[PDB]
Amino acid sequence: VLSPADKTNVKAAWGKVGAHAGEYGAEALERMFLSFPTTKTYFPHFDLSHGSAQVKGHGKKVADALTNAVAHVDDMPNALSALSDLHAHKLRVDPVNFKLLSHCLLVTLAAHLPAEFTPAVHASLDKFLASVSTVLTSKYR
Amino acid sequence: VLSPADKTNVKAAWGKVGAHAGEYGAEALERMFLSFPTTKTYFPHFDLSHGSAQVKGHGKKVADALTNAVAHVDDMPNALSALSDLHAHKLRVDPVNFKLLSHCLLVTLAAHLPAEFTPAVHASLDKFLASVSTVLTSKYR
Amino acid sequence: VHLTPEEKSAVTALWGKVNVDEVGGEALGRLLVVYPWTQRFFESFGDLSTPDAVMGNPKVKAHGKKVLGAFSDGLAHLDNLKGTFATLSELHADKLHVDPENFRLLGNVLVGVLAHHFGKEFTPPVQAAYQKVVAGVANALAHKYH
Amino acid sequence: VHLTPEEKSAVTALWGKVNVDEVGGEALGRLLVVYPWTQRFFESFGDLSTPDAVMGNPKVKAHGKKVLGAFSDGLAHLDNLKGTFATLSELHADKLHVDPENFRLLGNVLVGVLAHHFGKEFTPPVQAAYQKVVAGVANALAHKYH
Ligand code: HEM
Ligand code: HEM
Ligand code: HEM
Ligand code: HEM
């Protein structure tokens, strides 16, 4: 469960991201595709080239869902319910990949937040991403 | 989350395990130790030879806790409370090993319950073990 | 992989008793039941509505037999799985787009079926050797992923 | 491990800038903060109760430098991680009893710290080369587990 301190840390760091949420989302994807090439099997329909508008576009959507998640930290399952459905019954991404994107999102935040990414904040974000991943995979079976 | 059908499939199969619960637990552990040797790092204080009293005891403690979990499926978080704490603060087993032990418990069930291990039962059991695994690791951080 | 001679013999001995068609169909079916997300690739096989339906779908069973037939073939080259599977590796990554995690899921379902089929003859040491083979086949298959 | 000219140049060049002492203490400290169950191996190190306590604990800092100094020597032997880490593997499995999963956790955390420290210079492709490296190291340290 996210502790009051964790909820606090998450709101404080995400806050800081602000309107860069989108660019950060795209860089997290690029990091994922290059670091973990099996994840590209889910996007045979995209141009995965550096600078791809498709990646940008998809980065922005992911980013906006996490924004929605942050705002609804006390009620995640409802807020992400359409997304849970989607991933569970249409996309059908193996649960394993969620750890991978989470890692790359953390990496992107660390590279962008020199002051804010303290050990404490790092632990709270990790816990928040694992929580987001849990909700997204909750209706799989 | 467990469907009501999953709850039925689980009580059905475990009922079947009955008195052999302890023997199946020792066997699950022996399978774990041979198949996944990094798990042995958690028992450097144990005599791990075949049929050792220590393996047999732990086996029985493991089965009792699973029995307790089947008995209180609608209330796992409460029923395994003490065990969540123990694994969280004292034992601190990396969460990955729970999947390994789960797999070996599944294998042992398959080997012992020819008539009951249907595809639907198989699925409910895997979710059940995954749920137990989730409860035991829930207080980790 | 690095199987000792005794391990190699255990594996080949048990494999001698397998009806590949039957077990192929069963392992694929249980894959699709236990981890339904793996269904994503089989939209063209038809009806995967219930466990009964998956298990009974002839398309599933025919795929089960081809997959396990290649597996069976690979047991003849335990000393060179990467070589044996290089071409299938390429096909799976480049045309089929199958995340190599499914290879790991199939291998653990495979072991379950072997245990359900063979009961007490599937001892712990026997499981340990099939565990090395399945991890080895999954690694050879994931090799050409780039 | 297998690194392209591109990737090898990237790893060595960034490493040149790393103060092993500073980065090693940080990487170990964040490991025990982020995944607290890893504290199980460091009972004699002191108070590890809260973040501030971990980070400025002298035994943590010390141990961080040792581990990273060993990691560094491995970078000079990208071609034979296995023989380079054979002794340490045996130590970790036999004497310290450390689940090799922790090597994977450390590796992820080190990537994080290198990102935090280097910012935009730690680009996607650089990340990528470091990810193969930490996975190679993790696998070379898990080699002697029996
Ligand atoms: C942080 C966890 C994730 C979040 C918040 C997330 C969020 C989303 C969103 C908002 C969409 C678009 C839905 C719509 O169009 O309204 C989407 C689609 C999709 N997601 Fe997820 N996702 C996550 C993880 C993943 C992972 C790990 C993968 C696989 C590597 C994945 C693969 C995709 C695919 C392939 C699509 C469809 C892309 C398209 O064809 O437009 N997602 N995701
Ligand atoms: C289905 C999952 C599991 C269940 C239900 C479970 C249950 C138990 C129980 C009932 C105890 C004894 C508590 C007592 O004495 O008060 C125990 C202890 C312990 N468990 Fe867990 N366990 C599980 C998974 C694991 C895993 C995955 C590992 C490591 C590979 C592990 C390692 C240990 C150790 C080493 C002990 C202490 C043994 C001794 O010193 O007597 N457990 N567990
Ligand atoms: C032991 C693991 C596996 C082996 C040896 C294997 C083997 C093969 C073989 C030999 C083919 C046909 C190649 C050809 O037509 O030349 C094939 C095709 C296929 N495989 Fe795999 N496979 C494995 C696992 C999987 C898994 C886990 C999935 C996904 C859930 C999968 C999905 C497919 C699909 C979608 C096709 C194409 C079917 C068609 O077009 O009829 N395979 N596989
Ligand atoms: C992954 C890269 C790692 C490398 C290269 C490595 C290297 C080392 C070295 C050089 C030593 C000193 C041993 C000697 O006396 O010869 C050591 C000790 C030790 N390592 Fe590792 N290590 C690694 C990871 C870890 C991890 C992740 C943990 C656990 C979380 C760990 C737990 C220990 C402990 C408990 C000791 C002994 C400390 C003491 O003496 O109290 N190591 N390691």
* Ligand with minimal distance to B128 CA: 2
Query: In the structure encoding, which two tokens stand for residue D83, read together?
Result: 């023989």
Q: Are A125 and A2 in contact (CB under 8 A)?
A: no
Instruction: Identify the CA nearest to A7 among candidates A64, A76, A58, A55.
Output: A76
Q: How far is the CA of B18 from the CAs of B15, B23, B61, B63, B70, in angstroms? A: 5, 10, 14, 10, 12
Task: State the chains in contact with B (3 or more Cβ–Cβ pairs under 8 Å).
Answer: A, C, D
Distance to chain B for A141, nearest Cα, Å:
8
B58 Cβ inside 6 Å of ligand 2: yes
Distance to chain C for B89, nearest Cα, Å:
31
Ligand 3 pocket test, candidate residues C96, C99, C145, most atoms within 8 A of CB: C96
> Which residues on chain B are in Cβ contact (under 8 Å) with A1?
138
Write the single-letter amino acid at C49. Answer: S
Residues C58 and C53: their CA atoms lie apart, in Å, by 10
Q: Are D103 and D137 in contact (CB under 8 A)?
A: yes
Residue A138's CB: how many other CB atoms inside 10 A? 16
Q: Which residue range(s) make up the domain with D27?
A: 1-146
Instruction: Identify the CA nearest to B96 among candidates D99, A137, A93, D32.
Output: D99
Query: Within an 8 Å CB–CB cutoff, is residue A56 touching chain D?
Result: no
Q: Are A70 and A11 in contact (CB under 8 A)?
A: yes
> In chain B, count of helices (H) and strands (E)?
7, 0
Indicate the SS3 state at residue D124.
helix
Q: Are C112 and B107 in contact (CB under 8 A)?
A: yes
Residues C132 and C138: their CA atoms lie apart, in Å, by 10
Q: How far is the CA of D110 from the CAs of B21, D20, D71, D104, D122, in angstroms? A: 43, 11, 11, 10, 12
Residues C4 and D124: their CA atoms lie apart, in Å, by 42
CATH class of the structural domain B1-141: mainly alpha
Query: Within an 8 Å CB–CB cutoff, is residue A88 touching chain C?
Result: yes
Instruction: Find the helix or strand (DSSP H, E) in which D105 lies.
Output: helix D101-118
For chain A, the structural domain boundaries read 1-141
Q: Are C28 and C60 in contact (CB under 8 A)?
A: yes
Give the ligand 2 atom nearest the CA of B101: 27
Resolution for the entry shown, Å:
1.8
**What is the full DSSP assignment across B86-120?**
HIIIII---THHHHHHHHHHHHHHHHH-TTT--HH
Query: In the structure encoding, which two tokens stand for residue D131, read together?
Result: 């990810």
Q: Provide the experimental method for this PDB entry.
A: X-ray
Burial class, C83, CB count within 10 angstroms (exposed 0-12 / middle 13-18 / buried 19+): exposed
Distance to chain A for D95, nearest Cα, Å:
30
> Which residues on chain C are in Cβ contact (under 8 Å) with A91?
40
> Which residues on chain C are in Cβ contact (under 8 Å) with B107?
111-112, 115, 122, 127
Query: Within an 8 Å CB–CB cutoff, is residue B141 touching chain A?
Result: yes
C68 Cβ inside 6 Å of ligand 3: no
Query: In the structure encoding, which two tokens stand for residue C4, read together?
Result: 């000792």
Q: How far is the CA of D97 from the CAs of A46, B35, B36, in angstroms? A: 45, 17, 14
Indicate the SS3 state at residue B17.
helix
**Cα of A62 from ligand 1 centre, angstroms:** 6
Residues C31 and C57: their CA atoms lie apart, in Å, by 13
Angle of helix C5-15 versus helix C124-142 axis, rounded to 10: 90
Domain count for chain C: 1
Q: Are C27 and C106 in contact (CB under 8 A)?
A: yes
Phi then psi dihedrals of residue C27, to 5 deg: -70, -45
